[PDB]
Design a protein around this ligand. Structure first.
Ligand code: CLR
Lengths: 105, 115, 31, 118, 34, 37, 121, 28
């Protein structure tokens, strides 16, 4: 018995038929109605473990589902060309700056 | 269809495009500008052109067991290198093309006076 | 995205150098 | 054969189909007829004013009157994103402004050196 | 949104390179006068 | 954002044009210093 | 219970299943077998590993249940829900991870000069 | 507006630093 993860426009929900007991991870927020839980915005990387109980068809069975998200918007596309083209000239600039210090003294 | 089989699938989460040759056959053969630039085996149907950020242009087509399909010129101006030439950037260009030149000249004047 | 908060880290570096040099200039000018 | 030539100036998109010099041609966009009077359908030019990406991006077919659109030469797929009074920097104005800046710095610092050495 | 971050990183790198190319020129010009 | 995308490349090229003048000045001062050795 | 350590480097994603470290395990996806099928050699199982390449957001994003040999598929009491915007040659990096590089660069640049100046004796 | 402020604050800080370096080195 899996725990359905419904999707609103930016809210990832956790739906059950009984009380949801958080185990370990991002608790997010609570909600007034029972058998529900909110995790917050889509771009938050909500990750945690939330075990649940059975339903009216699959009762006497404790279920557990872990939610994992990697919808990165803080990620940067590193390019071999750009990165190499900045470090190899930064080293040259540092070495040239280290030449005037020797020249003065 | 009218011998127009090549289609482009878009509107997904990521910035990528895929050419879909809507023709029943086996071992479909992709072309570009009339030449043999690509090939495909089974287990895959949508040829990949890369990202829309690199502006994939060209003139693409496919060919099945029947006669060759008809081309479809793809144009993608997702520039992302565009610079806004309003009344602030050109002013910024001039203010960076005068101060630097003036400092370089006031350094060269002292260098020559030393010489 | 992290662009708007990224310049002020580098611009902050230059303010430190400017204030240090103002301190030394005042020290070597008044005294 | 000859492909559709597209040119984007500022925020206005204008494209041509150079396969029939003189005829009565029609244009379509996702089987939505465009032409016959906003928008402009010239003899072989079409001008897409207010080219917003989310409403004009699809299949354009150029063909003379009396012919089925599916029997034309080929189609087009346009996904252009345009802005107001803005340019794009390919290697035609990025390898030119650099050259002119070098040739003007070299031509001005040398003059300053001549003026200062006298 | 994954390329704006790289553009900002490259701009910061160019700023950092410029802040050293100015210092090198200034140090050499100071040497020219002593 | 379409504003930050243009703002970043409107300053990337500006700093790519102030780096080809520092190299010119470095060449000038190197030529002026190598004549004293 | 022990979590499924999800390691995402570039496009390859590696899942670990330490729930049964003393047997041979399999994998499933929407009640469909995946891994150990000896086809589409990009994927592949191990003692606990599972490497999936050419990952996409649209497909291959759901329940990854790991169970050992001789185990009914609905016997496990743990499931995963992996929805990842797998990317090409890019990594997560915040402002703190860039300030620590700027400061280190400043320190190493300062270090070199303080040594060349002492080297002039 | 906010992003453009940094690219003009750096210039004024740079000019101030150069001017104060030049005027401080004058004392020799
Ligand atoms: C930023 C780049 C392009 C130009 C920098 C020019 C700098 C390096 C030049 C401009 C004027 C110069 C100064 C002019 C006069 C003197 C007085 C002398 O007794 C010691 C050197 C000193 C103090 C010079 C140091 C170098 C100096 C500050």
């Amino acid at each position: 018995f899996k725990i359905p993860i419904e999707e609103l426009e930016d809210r990832v929900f956790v739906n059950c038929n009984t009380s949801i007991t958080w185990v370990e991870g991002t608790v997010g927020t609570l909600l007034s109605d029972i058998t529900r839980l909110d995790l917050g915005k889509r771009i938050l990387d909500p990750r945690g473990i939330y075990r649940c109980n059975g339903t009216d068809i699959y009762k006497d069975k404790e279920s557990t589902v872990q939610v994992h998200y990697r919808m990165c918007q803080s990620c940067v596309e590193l390019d071999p060309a750009t990165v190499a083209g900045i470090i190899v000239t930064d080293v040259i600039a540092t070495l040239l700056l280290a030449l005037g210090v020797f020249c003065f003294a | 269809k009218g011998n127009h089989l090549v289609k482009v699938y878009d509107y997904q989460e990521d910035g990528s495009v895929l050419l879909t040759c809507d023709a029943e056959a086996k071992n479909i053969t992709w072309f570009k500008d009339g030449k043999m630039i690509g090939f495909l085996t089974e287990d895959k149907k949508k040829w990949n052109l890369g990202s829309n950020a690199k502006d994939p242009r060209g003139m693409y087509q496919c060919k099945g067991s029947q006669n060759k399909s008809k081309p479809l010129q793809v144009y993608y101006r997702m520039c992302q290198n565009c610079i806004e030439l309003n009344a602030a950037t050109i002013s910024g260009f001039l203010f960076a093309e005068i101060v630097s030149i003036f400092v370089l000249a006031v350094g060269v004047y002292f260098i020559a006076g030393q010489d | 995205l992290l662009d708007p908060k990224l310049c002020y880290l580098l611009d902050g570096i230059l303010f430190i150098y400017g204030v240090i040099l103002t301190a030394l200039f005042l020290r070597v000018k008044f005294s | 054969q000859t492909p559709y030539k597209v040119s984007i100036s500022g925020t206005t998109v204008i494209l041509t189909c150079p396969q029939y010099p003189g005829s009565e041609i029609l244009w379509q966009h996702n089987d939505k007829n465009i032409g016959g009077d906003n928008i402009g359908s010239d003899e072989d030019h079409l001008s897409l004013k207010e080219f917003s990406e989310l409403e004009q991006s699809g299949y354009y077919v150029c063909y003379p009157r009396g012919s089925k659109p599916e029997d034309a030469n080929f189609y087009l797929y346009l996904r252009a994103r345009v802005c107001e009074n803005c340019m794009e920097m390919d290697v035609m104005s990025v390898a030119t402004i650099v050259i002119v800046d070098i040739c003007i710095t070299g031509g001005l610092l040398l003059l300053v050196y001549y003026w200062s050495k006298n | 949104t994954e390329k704006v971050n790289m553009m900002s990183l490259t701009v910061l790198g160019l700023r950092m390179l410029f802040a050293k190319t100015v210092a090198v020129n200034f140090l050499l010009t100071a040497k020219l006068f002593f | 954002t379409l504003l930050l995308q243009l703002t970043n490349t409107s300053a990337y090229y500006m700093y790519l044009l102030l780096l080809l003048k520092s190299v010119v000045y470095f060449a000038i001062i190197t030529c002026c210093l190598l004549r004293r050795t």
